[PDB]
């Protein structure tokens with residue numbers, strides 16, 4: 465993880 | 472809670488450059504970097520904003536700084552606009568947040584185009600304004616967000632805010 469979103 | 476946490480619910484969060492729904496390079500909480508098709512262009516804009524070689528990746532504090540700048544720009548947009556400013560001036564702080572959210576999303580000119588809804592809000596006609604706002608293209612194209620924003624206009628409360636990444 466470590467990134468965000470939401471997809 | 473407050474405008475900052477609201478827009479956090481509505482905009483998402485990325486610490487690495489991504490393409491928004493319109494195909495534009497974006498980072499942070501809905502911070503548009505450029506409309507150019509070039510990822511290298513987006514990175515040069517980011518590097519300029521942050522003052523270092525980011526390679527497309529920022530820290531949470533950097534995301535937070537861009538976010539506060541963009542919130543401040545949304546408010547400056549309202550305050551400069553002869554249609555928005557008097558509505559905003561007349562609103563309580565919770566409903567002010569709803570107006571800032573809309574400007575954050577679509578710009579001052581977009582929001583200023585909601586002539587009837589704005590007059591209704593100016594007249595504290597909250598239910599009518601909410602009904603009228605739900606007729607819009609905005610509501611149809613982004614209904615999850617528009618519903619929450621509209622409930623906030625209707626109620627003047629934070630009630631509508633009370634996977635797929637990580």
Ligand SMILES: *[C@@H]1O[C@H](CO)[C@@H](O)[C@H](O)[C@H]1NC(=O)CCCCCCC(C)C
Nearest residue numbers: 484500531532534535536538634636637
């Ligand atoms: C990320 O989403 C996860 C899955 O929904 C949650 O479990 C997790 O708590 C979430 N994290 C956070 O929201 C904290 C990240 C801090 C980001 C703050 C930066 C912004 C720019 C203020």
Ligand SMILES: *[C@@H]1O[C@H](CO)[C@@H](O)[C@H](O)[C@H]1NC(C)=O
Nearest residue numbers: 470471480481482483634635
């Ligand atoms: C993030 O994804 C979740 C799950 O699909 C969704 O409920 C939420 O609305 C999304 N947030 C945004 C800003 O798109």
Ligand SMILES: *[C@H]1O[C@H](CO)[C@@H](O)[C@H](O)[C@@H]1O
Nearest residue numbers: 467469471487489635636
């Ligand atoms: C979630 O999934 C997409 C893959 O399509 C990535 O683009 C994103 O960085 C995240 O990993």
